Amino acid sequence: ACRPCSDAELLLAACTSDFVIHGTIHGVAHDTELQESVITVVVARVIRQTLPLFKEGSSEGQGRASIRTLLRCGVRPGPGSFLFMGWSRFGEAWLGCAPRFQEFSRVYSAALTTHLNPCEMALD
Secondary structure, three states: OOOOOOHHHHHHHHHHOOEEEEEEEEEEEEEOOOOEEEEEEEEEEEEEEOOOOOOOOEOOEOEEEEEEEEHHHOOOOOOOEEEEEEEEEOOEEEEEEOOEHHHHHHHHHHHHHHOOOOOOOOOO
């Protein structure tokens, strides 16, 4: 449940997911009882969502929001911008895939160019 998504999986997930957001990891909190992690992301942009999970920006400037995953996946804060995608459970975001933004951009460009993209989205 922690393995990276293949490029084919990324493409399908980005169209079928409840949310797709671009951002960086500010911090990670761990729940050692539930064995889950809560990832706090700085949201650069909401690409698409099926539910009002996320928004971009705030009165403080940047907006932050959190995404759950399994503790064993070992997610860490770090530099790097990612495209987080996943599903909602009880109104909480859960992580499905998290490619680097430039990696998903490559995949989507290739899919668009081959007309293999299952949907359209604006990554910019």
